[PDB]
Amino acid sequence: AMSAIKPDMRIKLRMEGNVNGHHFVIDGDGTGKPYEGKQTMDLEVKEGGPLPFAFDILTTAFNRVFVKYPDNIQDYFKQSFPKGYSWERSMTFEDGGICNARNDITMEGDTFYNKVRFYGTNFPANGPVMQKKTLKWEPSTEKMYVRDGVLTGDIEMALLLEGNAHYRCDFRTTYKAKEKGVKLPGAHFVDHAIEILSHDKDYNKVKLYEHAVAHSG
């Protein structure tokens, strides 16, 4: 049988968000190569712009289907389709900032649909997020393992800032296939690299790119 996952897929996304009380809506239109672990999104703020905080804190919320998995590691996410899966994420920043995010991922035809919710709070008014001092996320390694019976990914993240410093964050994401029969994979790692390829001056429009590869170390 031919895989539910097609080698060239489109992506549709809407995020409803609130960071330090600032409400916003962002739409995404993208394409990706699931078996190459590559995807590109064009994002557009639809409400609440210009955003008064660093766009970078949102970008990892804009799907682990787009990972190049070797044949010796079980691919939980590609096995989650056609039905799909969802994830919940906590992001705990070094200065007390805290974000919680969720994505519900479904498939219709050649397109992944993403229903994203994003909540951030406790960011200091003088900190780099509210002051828009971020430059990029550094490439990262996500540790995939089963925690309390649920596939979980832990990441030590780092935002490069203006002025020779990093702003660090702990990610924990829980991943759940909609079909409860999908077998849990063995522990492994996923290397990520996310980058903004271009953006407007006020980040109303952003082009985003991610490359990810799975490995056993």
Contact partners, residue 164, CB within 8 Å, separation at least 6: none
Experimental technique behind these coordinates: X-ray
Query: What are the structural domains of the chain?
Result: 9-215 (2.40.155.10)
DSSP the chain: ---SS-SSEEEEEEEEEEETTEEEEEEEEEEEETTTTEEEEEEEEEESPSPSS-GGGGGGG--TTSSB--TTS--TTGGGTTT-EEEEEEEEETTS-EEEEEEEEEEETTEEEEEEEEEEE---TTSTTTTT-EEEEPPEEEEEEEETTEEEEEEEEEEEETTTEEEEEEEEEEEEESSTTPPPPPSEEEEEEEEEEEE-TTSSEEEEEEEEEEE--
Q: This structure's resolution (angstroms)?
A: 1.9
Q: Residue 56, Cβ neighbours under 10 Å: how many?
A: 23
Distance CA 38, CA 29 (A): 15
Instruction: List, as own/partner pairs, every contact residues 23-26 make where C-beta atoms lie below 8 angstroms and the sequence separation is at least 24, other chains included.
Output: 23/47, 23/48, 24/48, 24/49, 24/51, 26/58, 26/62
| Cβ proximity of 207 and 31 under 8 Å | no
Q: What angle do CA 29, 81, 182 make, to 5 degrees?
A: 140
